[PDB]
Design a protein around this ligand. Structure first.
Ligand code: ZN
Length: 323
């Protein structure tokens, strides 16, 4: 009986030196992400809407154009909702599908439903169009390094549909795509042919990005079983800062601070966390001031903060994958 699902407990990063850090800082482009990955998503995209379809095609197209060997799957299913039965479609993009272990980055691509109000439309810029765009920019910026994966460990991206409640949050009206996918992964043997291990056992760590893009975010260290990875984000932020590789950034105003949070924040990691998957929850506390208002738009995003977080996340991912 293999102990491979315990490998994630001892897994250590291969830390980048200064020269490599400067290279990663220079290899991501916030303006290219803005134009090519983010703006096409700043549209109404609640589940089942025309915008949902457009957002899903955009995400698939941007991944498909890359050199790395991404395998795209659309996980479509039905769920009861306050409005009756509806269909939802999660997007999963995976490098090395048969690799036993994957580091998983995720966010939700649906936007919360709101009837148009005084001609304004909710596009959920921080929630979570930016997180989607950060994942797409990370795939683009690290494409040459990721192509080399073509340590039985690789990378997977998940874009959840139906994170938002159709009304106000309730246990049955929220997290449609993640409750469905977590259950599906928990009941799918992995690697193919396995007798007793599932796709969830293969999830080394679920890094969930949510509500990112406002000024001065502070991310709490939520869980003890991922605290050492939260510490790595702190260290990466500190070193990128010291090397002069971040913009409009100070250590007093750092994003990863030393502080936990006792409470529970309901989000797409919950169905995974309750089935034993380690989670690194990159959601700020407090939430952006524009949360769930028509002001959660492009004008209120903080460009340099998103750029700095792209650098930090890309270094974290390369160090985890030893690339
Ligand atoms: Zn929301």
């Amino acid at each position: 009986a293999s102990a491979w699902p315990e490998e994630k407990n001892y897994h250590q990063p291969a830390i980048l030196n200064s020269s490599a850090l400067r290279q990663i800082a220079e290899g991501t482009s916030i303006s290219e992400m803005w134009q090519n990955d983010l703006q096409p998503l700043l549209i109404e995209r609640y589940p089942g809407s025309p915008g949902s379809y457009a957002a899903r095609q955009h995400i698939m197209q941007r991944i498909q154009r890359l050199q790395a060997d991404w395998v795209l799957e659309i996980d479509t299913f039905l769920s009861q909702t306050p409005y009756g039965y509806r269909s939802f479609s999660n997007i999963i993009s995976t490098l090395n599908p048969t690799a036993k272990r994957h580091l998983v980055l995720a966010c939700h691509y649906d936007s919360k439903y709101f009837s148009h109000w005084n001609n304004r439309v909710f596009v959920g810029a921080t929630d979570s169009a930016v997180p989607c765009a950060m994942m797409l920019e990370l795939a683009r910026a690290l494409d040459k390094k990721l192509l080399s994966l073509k340590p039985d460990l690789s990378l997977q991206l998940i874009f959840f549909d139906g994170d938002e409640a159709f009304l106000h949050w309730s246990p049955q009206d929220s997290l449609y795509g993640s409750r469905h996918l977590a259950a599906k992964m928990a009941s799918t043997p992995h690697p193919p042919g396995a007798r007793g291990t599932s796709q969830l056992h293969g999830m080394d760590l679920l890094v969930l990005l949510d509500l990112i893009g406002a000024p001065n975010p502070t991310f709490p260290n939520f869980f003890p079983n991922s605290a050492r990875w939260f510490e790595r984000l702190q260290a990466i932020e500190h070193e990128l800062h010291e090397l002069g590789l971040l913009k409009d950034h100070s250590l007093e105003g750092r994003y990863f601070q030393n502080y936990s949070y006792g409470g529970v924040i309901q989000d797409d990691h919950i169905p995974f966390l309750r089935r034993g998957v380690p989670v690194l929850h990159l959601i700020p506390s407090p939430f952006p001031e524009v949360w769930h208002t028509m002001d959660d738009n492009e004008e209120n995003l903080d460009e340099s903060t998103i750029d700095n977080l792209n650098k930090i996340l890309q270094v974290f991912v390369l160090e985890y994958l030893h690339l």
